From a paper:
DnaJ protects the cell from adverse conditions through the prevention of protein aggregation or by assisting the refolding of unfolded proteins and is an essential partner of the chaperone DnaK in bacterial DnaK–DnaJ–GrpE chaperone systems. DnaJ, the bacterial homologue of Hsp40, stimulates ATP hydrolysis by DnaK (Hsp70) and thus mediates capture of substrate protein, but is also known to possess chaperone activity of its own. T. thermophilus DnaJ is a typical type II DnaJ, i.e. it lacks the zinc-finger domains found in type I DnaJs such as that of E. coli. Crystal structures of the complete molecular cochaperone DnaJ from Thermus thermophilus comprising the J, GF and C-terminal domains and of the J and GF domains alone showed an ordered GF domain interacting with the J domain.
Based on limited proteolysis of a DnaK–DnaJ–DafA complex, we first designed a construct containing the first 114 amino acids (DnaJ114), comprising the J and GF domains, and determined its structure to 1.64 Å resolution by radiation-damage-induced phasing from a mercury(II) chloride derivative. After the Pro6 motif, the GF domain folds onto one side of the J domain in a spiral, making extensive hydrophobic interactions, mainly via the conserved phenylalanine residues. Only two hydrogen bonds are formed between the J and the GF domains: from the Tyr69 hydroxyl group to the side chain of Glu99 and between the side chains of Glu52 and Ser94. In correspondence with the NMR observations for the partially disordered E. coli DnaJ GF domain, the T. thermophilus DnaJ GF domain binds to helix III of the J domain opposite helix II. In the DnaJ114 structure, no electron density was observed for residues 108–114 connecting the GF and the C-terminal domains in the complete protein.
Author numbering: 2 to 101
């Protein structure tokens, strides 16, 4: 329900560029990816990192996230829904499911 802080998960400011987001994700993926790190702690952290990246790496989805909780009126969801190809979305947080 409460707004997750995807910027804190990746270690970047709210005003980060998409390039900065990409490089922060890559730094973390090099550490927590399944076949480099087989620990359960790595699995759970990487889940969080992937959801954060799923949202923040697509500028259009990032905008929806950034506007969440503000006093600005929200945009009606677009035709067909959203597209999170290359992400394990069915297992993402209830905040994510609610937001998108």
């Amino acid at each position: 329900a409460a707004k997750k802080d995807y910027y804190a998960i990746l270690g970047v400011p709210r005003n980060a560029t998409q390039e900065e987001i990409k490089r922060a994700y890559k730094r973390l993926a090099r550490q927590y990816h399944p076949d480099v790190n087989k620990s359960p702690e790595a699995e759970e952290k990487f889940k969080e990192i992937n959801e954060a990246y799923a949202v923040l790496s697509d500028p259009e989805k990032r905008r929806i996230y950034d506007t969440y909780g503000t006093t600005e009126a929200p945009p009606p969801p677009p035709p067909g829904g959203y597209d999170f190809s290359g992400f394990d979305v069915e297992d993402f947080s209830e905040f994510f499911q609610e937001l998108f």
